[PDB]
């Protein structure tokens, strides 16, 4: 099982390669030291037991977290969210409206406190200092995966915009793909409400950052050369309310993506009959087209269909659709088995922005801080896609190498 | 034969408070009631289309509620029913998130190029046959394929000079039609849809009749307008934002007028206290009110202060209140000519919300032209009203 | 039934306003003993005087039947997600704040939309102003935000002051700030109402409020300047303007709409990290040997001197200290969240009347630590030059604002101490 998946490292880098415009000009001390670190903190927080023990706290610690934020909702919606719903409407009773999206929210108002205090600004301080000094890269980007690990997508340009303006093509590559990589509070918490697996998410952004800017700089080296809230009371209100206009971007996304998927089932299920099937979904489709995928990252393959199915209905639609699918398979009332090794892979994979919708959140959020490089950026959309897409994949490989503990 | 003269008032009302007796084009408007009344028969007297398209969307309908049932879970499940009653029905959990969906349907639809095709199709023919404007032959179309609030989406170009009556048509065309909310929210309150399919068809030409009966048309009109959806992922996404804050917007506007009217009701109730009379309120008013209105459609006086206070509540409150108190007089006096009439009459989202809806965000498209799109509202819902009035006597006319 | 506490209350607050003041000597006394002396009056005609509390009572029936006419509304919407039927099923947990309360928030907004295009509230505004400048020492302009900051807050921008607040006076600006900071528009009124809240004291409060907020405010920082009223103006545009009554509901009631989803999010925000840092200050006080401490009972502990002066009696003055507190230093709504379980048989504590009186007048306003960065920012787009000095008196704002409704509560306590 070990060398299956260190061929998935090899494979993935492999990829990387091809589709890199520029295959020499590679340092390897940053690349295959960004790359180290991942694995390191990968082995770290799983393999060795004072991994499991302070990953597992931490767990504990956001978990309280979160149920104070349904302290929040259990106050704002009431007893809509009670345990007297399961006693009526059970399996159904579970509103994903009105539990999940709250929490963006709150996480949101969290974070921009955590901005207005300084204590993001100080550890971003921290580990950004910490990537430039051990691969050498740039400042900027560095702090930029900081940052994009712990914060939304909207509240992350708050470090990043002064330095867009002269920040180079990798560095901003670097940007992007850490951004596509990592994934924010807000939707993490959701993550969790969700019922997915938290330990697992947290290594998910952990790994996430150092993966981002890894495949940023294989995908495109550097050639050229590198260079408001009142009180804390408003911060947190802005927070919330920020959040509020993202819960109902994200909730009304979804509702949009389950729809129109279903009805994307309703025809091609529709022509399989002139082609003679009966019945066919868009998810066993990508199954069939990223198994091969799922296969490379360690997966067994009787899983591995239902895996890459899961990780293609991510990268073409985005990741909320996914999870929601992946936690029939949690909830175990059902008798659909998936293995440790696979729970563990899916769960880091699906963490991650990256999808075609992405894109155009990007070049649009980023065209009204630095519009002089809109069309550079629209141009590594793709790719950077692509990046974070191959780093939350590489992560997932290093979820399938560590057998030692086993998942909830 | 009571049908033919009620047509003939209809018109001549519109007419009475027309601005312009030049209307140089008769042969657009005739021939335009022509083209409801013939539709009408096509899809009712004679005889496979209309079947199969009404279950299509049938099936698309049930998407959404997928969709819904998805975010919003139990809570739009059937056992609110065992639990509350028929007031377990939810509006704003039920229908509005349709109209997240739709949208988002049509950017698809844009970014694949469907409706470029199928507007261009039909927009073509009306401008062709009845010779008027393109404009407000495509968003026509979008009102027969979808609501109030998603159709301006297309005409921005165009609406820039709108010659003033392009953008009346626009109006009241959109106030008239259904599909995406009110069709939905129908289907779910159990009305047969195909019937309202039918009605949806018949719906949006009659706006062009009634809009060109009150403002016709002079300036030039096509050259106009001198960030992108991207792929088709963002595109389903930014419609399904846009389209969702419109539908907060809706929600938010609906319970308001609701609520005035009921504030009206408590002024009629307060001002009558020392008139003696007392207890008297909108509900009755206007049902005596439309009430020769609704003797003149065909309907008899038998069963016609029913459509007072139901016709009434449509021009003030909604046709969904209308609807509510409707089936209130369904299971007990109803005549079968008297309710398909009611029915139809009864189909059409125009109200005052309406308008201020389709004033609100048009004019957020055309900040200059704000003041005169607004000033044009209430003339608007009258053109609308009358044209699912013609398509209500006409159902008469199959009855 | 001596009640001479009272006084001494009046006495304390106008004391510390006079000693936190900028300059002592340029009060007009006739101006604030004025003011004060409408507080109180007011204070008198509506709570002891049978006949004004009549009025209060005829008032009070009639926008509670635009309540109905609002739950009315609701339950078309909502539909019967809000009906009788929870109670019977989610019990106590069945009121849903979400679904109860926000609304009226959106239907007011809607309703003053109305009332500002057929031109009530200008006229009534116009009244209030014209009496207030008339009597006391205030500028026209100060006068007329005083007035229409009764019905409507900076929720709905007043737009009497668009003319004025460029090139208005250091004085002048601090009085409308702290007008603002002092009164409840009337969309957070209503849901003031539906979480329960006594309506009649509301009223009453809003009323207090506007001539406290004078008060206070001329205390603070006295007119040192000329005023200018009707010499010259240059208003612009004709503003920007609803078009006709329709387009008035219209963006009056999706405004209304906006500020409900804001309100709502910032609650949540709010009881939860309160909760949180609740969590951390329980551990913390766990290690010193308090098992059970919180963010409330420290304020209270803080307060209490507050409390005991404006006349609350010293067992319930833990209570009030922590409310009050947290309308200072959180904001009104969590505060009365806390509150109303304070107003049901079924809760264990009970309250003297006048207590109950006292603390609901004394949590009606803006006063907060937010609203300061709230008014900033709605203010500067109407004058940006002026946001600095803006931003310089935000604080004393707060505190201005704050002892008004103090004030206020002193009153009730005193008056509603006499008829009940
Ligand atoms: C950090 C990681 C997050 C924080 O870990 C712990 O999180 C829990 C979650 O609340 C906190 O509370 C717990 O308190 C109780 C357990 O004592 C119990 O009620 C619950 O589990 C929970 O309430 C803990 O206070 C909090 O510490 C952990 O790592 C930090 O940094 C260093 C590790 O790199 C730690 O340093 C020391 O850690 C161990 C302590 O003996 C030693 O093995 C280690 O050699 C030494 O360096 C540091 O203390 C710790 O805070
Ligand atoms: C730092 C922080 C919150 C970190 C949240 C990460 C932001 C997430 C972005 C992804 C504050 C650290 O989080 C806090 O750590 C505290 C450790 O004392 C927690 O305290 C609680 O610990 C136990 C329960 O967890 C109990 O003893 C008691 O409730 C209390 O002492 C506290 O709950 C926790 O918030």
Same mark, same amino acid.
């Given at each position: 099982?070990?060398?299956? !998946? ?14 890199? =415009? ?12 960004? *790359? ?34 349904? /302290?929040?909702?259990? #106050?704002?919606? %009431?007893?809509?969210? !009670? ?7 059970? %399996?159904? $009773? @579970? ?10 929210? *709150? @996480?949101? +108002? ?23 000094? &051990? ?7 560095? &702090? ?5 690990? @712990? ?15 002269? &920040?180079?093509? +990798?560095?901003? #590559? ?10 924010? %509070? ?7 409400? &969700? ?30 050369? =590198?260079?408001?809230? =009142? ?10 309310? =920020? ?21 994307? /089932? ?5 022509? $399989? %009959? ?15 087209? *990223? +198994? ?33 699918? #992946? ?25 991650? #922005? ?34 974070? !897409?191959?780093? /939350?994949?590489? +992560? ?13």
């Amino acid at each position: 099982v070990v060398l299956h !998946s260190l061929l998935g490292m090899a494979v993935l880098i492999a990829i990387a390669v091809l589709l890199s =415009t520029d295959r020499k000009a590679i340092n390897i001390r940053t690349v295959a030291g960004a *790359f180290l670190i991942q694995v390191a903190l990968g082995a770290l927080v799983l393999y060795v037991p004072q991994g499991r023990d302070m990953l597992g706290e931490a767990s504990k610690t956001i978990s309280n977290v979160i149920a104070y934020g349904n /302290n929040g909702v259990d #106050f704002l919606f %009431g007893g809509l969210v !009670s345990e007297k719903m399961f006693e009526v409407f059970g %399996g159904g $009773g @579970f509103v994903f409206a009105l539990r999940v999206l709250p929490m963006i929210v *709150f @996480f949101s +108002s969290l974070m921009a406190v955590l901005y207005y205090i300084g204590v993001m600004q100080l550890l971003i301080k921290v580990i950004g200092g910490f990537l430039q000094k &051990m691969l050498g890269t740039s400042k900027a980007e560095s &702090m930029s995966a900081a940052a994009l690990i @712990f914060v939304g997508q909207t509240e992350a340009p708050l470090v990043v915009r002064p330095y867009i303006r002269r &920040m180079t093509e +990798s560095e901003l #590559f670097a940007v992007m793909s850490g951004g596509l990589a990592s994934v924010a %509070g807000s939707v993490l918490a959701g993550y969790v409400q &969700m019922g997915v697996p938290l330990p697992y998410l947290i290594a998910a952004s952990f790994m996430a950052a150092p993966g981002g800017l890894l495949f940023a700089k294989l995908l495109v080296p550097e050639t050229e050369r =590198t260079q408001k809230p =009142t009180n804390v009371i408003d911060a947190a209100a802005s927070g919330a309310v =920020t959040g509020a206009q993202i819960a109902i971007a994200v909730g009304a996304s979804l509702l949009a993506f389950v729809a129109l998927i279903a009805m994307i /089932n309703g025809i091609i299920g529709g022509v $399989g %009959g002139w082609f003679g099937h009966g019945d066919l979904t868009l998810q066993a489709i990508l199954g069939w087209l *990223f +198994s091969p995928l799922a296969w490379v990252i360690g997966v067994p393959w009787s899983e591995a269909g239902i895996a890459g199915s899961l990780i293609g209905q991510k990268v073409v639609i985005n990741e909320f659709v996914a999870y929601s699918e #992946f936690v029939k398979y949690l909830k175990p009332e059902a008798a659909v088995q998936l293995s440790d090794t696979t729970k563990a892979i899916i769960s880091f994979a699906l963490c991650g #922005f990256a999808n075609l919708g992405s894109i155009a959140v990007l070049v649009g959020g980023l065209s009204i801080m630095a519009p002089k490089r809109r069309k550079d950026v629209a141009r590594l959309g793709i790719k950077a896609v692509v990046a974070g !897409s191959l780093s /939350n994949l590489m +992560s997932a490989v290093i979820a399938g190498l560590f057998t030692g503990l086993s998942g909830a």
